[PDB]
Amino acid sequence: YNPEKKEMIQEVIVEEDLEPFEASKETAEQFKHQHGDKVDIFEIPETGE
Amino acid sequence: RQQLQVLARYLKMDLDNGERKFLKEKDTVAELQAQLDYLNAELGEFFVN
Amino acid sequence: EEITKDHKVLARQQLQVLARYLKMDLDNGERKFLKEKDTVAELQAQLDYLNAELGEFFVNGVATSFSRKKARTFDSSWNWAKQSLLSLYFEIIHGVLKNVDREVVSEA
Amino acid sequence: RQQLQVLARYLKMDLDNGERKFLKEKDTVAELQAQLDYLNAELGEFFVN
Amino acid sequence: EEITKDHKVLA
């Protein structure tokens, strides 16, 4: 904890689709549950992620 | 790939739209097949046929 | 200008994609410029403090003026003696010095 | 590189503008540092500090 | 919208 550098988080609306990133099945499903139609989750048949 | 995504964004083309529809339809297939499997477990193969 | 704006945005995105592929930092010159501008500001703050401290007159007046190449030597007293003799001679004959005044004595 | 230059030219984007400003500012830094070095050579480190 | 149609077709 550095009071000179106090961590916060700013809510922003995504203005452009971000590059896809890998995630687990459960993690991706949680992301889909949160964002609804504002996220796309797709299985990778090569590794099942 | 990046150039293709840029062009798709400009064209307002949803590359994932067919995939999303396919997964929705696959879930529909799974639920209808669950219904048919239940009716087959209930009435039996001989009765249903 | 919606169509031209959309085309400009497409060209911008294509340029960013190419810069990313080329590993080219478009903002690098700008970042260096802002860092150097901060350096300019801090050096100017130092100079402004020294000017507030010593004053404009002092800071300007401490400006260097000496240089070896600029020194002028005068040693041709032989020639200047002959010239002064001719000047005094002609002044006497032309009557600029009718009498033996102290200027004539000093030139002698 | 040629494709990027073509796009930058079309966009009226000066890729060298930041670098040009940086060299101008670096020259300004050199000149201000020359003045400070002269004042330090003149008054001395002890006086200036 | 011929010019924007050409834009889209080229893209």
Swiss-Prot record, chains B, D:
Function: Fatty acid synthetase catalyzes the formation of long-chain fatty acids from acetyl-CoA, malonyl-CoA and NADPH. The alpha subunit contains domains for: acyl carrier protein, 3-oxoacyl-[acyl-carrier-protein] reductase, and 3-oxoacyl-[acyl-carrier-protein] synthase. This subunit coordinates the binding of the six beta subunits to the enzyme complex.
Recorded family membership: Belongs to the thiolase-like superfamily. Fungal fatty acid synthetase subunit alpha family.
Protein name: Fatty acid synthase subunit alpha
Additional remark text: Present with 17000 molecules/cell in log phase SD medium.
Name of encoding gene: FAS2
Quaternary structure annotation from Swiss-Prot or TrEMBL: [Alpha(6)beta(6)] hexamers of two multifunctional subunits (alpha and beta).
Whole-protein residues included: 340 to 388 of 1887
Entry comment on modification after translation: 4'-phosphopantetheine is transferred from CoA to a specific serine of the Acyl carrier domain by the C-terminal PPT domain. This modification is essential for activity because fatty acids are bound in thioester linkage to the sulfhydryl of the prosthetic group.
